[PDB]
Scaffold this active site. Structure first.
Site, PDB file in Angstrom:
ATOM      1  N   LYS A  44      19.766  54.164  27.744  1.00  0.00           N
ATOM      2  CA  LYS A  44      19.367  55.272  26.872  1.00  0.00           C
ATOM      3  C   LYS A  44      19.005  54.795  25.476  1.00  0.00           C
ATOM      4  O   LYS A  44      19.804  54.124  24.815  1.00  0.00           O
ATOM      5  CB  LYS A  44      20.503  56.301  26.775  1.00  0.00           C
ATOM      6  CG  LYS A  44      20.121  57.592  26.058  1.00  0.00           C
ATOM      7  CD  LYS A  44      19.150  58.427  26.878  1.00  0.00           C
ATOM      8  CE  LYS A  44      18.667  59.681  26.156  1.00  0.00           C
ATOM      9  NZ  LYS A  44      17.554  60.333  26.906  1.00  0.00           N
ATOM     10  N   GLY A 104      25.505  51.015  22.514  1.00  0.00           N
ATOM     11  CA  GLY A 104      25.341  49.776  23.241  1.00  0.00           C
ATOM     12  C   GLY A 104      23.888  49.343  23.334  1.00  0.00           C
ATOM     13  O   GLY A 104      23.561  48.150  23.227  1.00  0.00           O
ATOM     14  N   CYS A 105      23.024  50.351  23.518  1.00  0.00           N
ATOM     15  CA  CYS A 105      21.551  49.997  23.763  1.00  0.00           C
ATOM     16  C   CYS A 105      20.876  49.472  22.450  1.00  0.00           C
ATOM     17  O   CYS A 105      20.039  48.730  22.451  1.00  0.00           O
ATOM     18  CB  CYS A 105      20.842  51.190  24.442  1.00  0.00           C
ATOM     19  SG  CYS A 105      21.533  51.647  25.973  1.00  0.00           S
ATOM     20  N   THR A 106      21.384  50.115  21.330  1.00  0.00           N
ATOM     21  CA  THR A 106      20.904  49.701  20.011  1.00  0.00           C
ATOM     22  C   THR A 106      21.393  48.277  19.708  1.00  0.00           C
ATOM     23  O   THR A 106      20.629  47.442  19.232  1.00  0.00           O
ATOM     24  CB  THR A 106      21.370  50.690  18.923  1.00  0.00           C
ATOM     25  OG1 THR A 106      20.844  51.984  19.227  1.00  0.00           O
ATOM     26  CG2 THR A 106      20.884  50.264  17.543  1.00  0.00           C
ATOM     27  N   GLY A 162      19.309  45.831  21.792  1.00  0.00           N
ATOM     28  CA  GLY A 162      17.960  45.680  21.266  1.00  0.00           C
ATOM     29  C   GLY A 162      17.905  44.882  19.975  1.00  0.00           C
ATOM     30  O   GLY A 162      17.030  44.026  19.799  1.00  0.00           O
TER      31      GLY A 162
END
Ligand SMILES: [Cl-]
Ligand code: NA
Ligand code: NA
Length: 158
Positions: free
Chosen positions: A41, A46-48, A51
């Site tokens: 998402k 976590g995704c930030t 990235g």
């Protein structure tokens, strides 16, 4: 022989919608290494973190001639907003129909809530210059991950 995963032939010709409004395909990346990281998402902790970790390492991926693609099923506009806010200098695939996700078998099921629940499992892959999936990471631990992927890439490319 060196492949750890086999993709349907059509996968390499799927039009992949990118942040910024263009499309790519996996076949279009022939001749160079490609890192493909799947995450659940946009704009979540976590995704930030993941990235930003890849973004910080871009010059190191560049040294190996490699390109990176992040993938989730968020929209192009969501991806544009995420890239702009975080300063990402690599593209994000808007895999809205989960075609690319299914090809890499990253849509996993969990028996939860008395239901069979399907979702993107955080996963990363290394695609050789001739389009072979030569390394995979599944159920990814974000901490240390981008560093580990870079190290593996270097080992494979050398
Ligand atoms: Cl695999
Ligand atoms: Na964001
Ligand atoms: Na490639």
């Amino acid at each position: 022989t060196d492949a750890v995963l086999e993709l349907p032939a059509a996968t390499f010709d799927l039009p992949l919608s990118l942040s910024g409004g263009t499309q790519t395909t996996l076949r279009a990346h022939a001749g160079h290494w490609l890192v493909i990281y799947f995450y659940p998402k946009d704009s979540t902790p976590g995704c930030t973190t993941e990235g930003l970790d890849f973004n910080a390492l871009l010059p190191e991926f560049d040294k190996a001639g490699a390109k990176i693609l992040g993938v989730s099923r968020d929209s192009v506009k969501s991806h544009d907003n995420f890239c702009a806010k975080q300063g990402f200098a690599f593209p994000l695939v808007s895999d809205g129909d989960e075609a690319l996700c299914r090809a890499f078998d990253v849509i996993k099921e969990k028996n939860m809530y008395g239901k069979q629940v399907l979702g993107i499992e955080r996963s990363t892959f290394l695609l050789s210059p001739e389009g072979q999936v030569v390394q995979a990471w599944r159920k990814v631990k974000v901490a240390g991950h981008a560093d580990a992927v870079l190290a593996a890439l270097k080992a494979h490319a050398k």
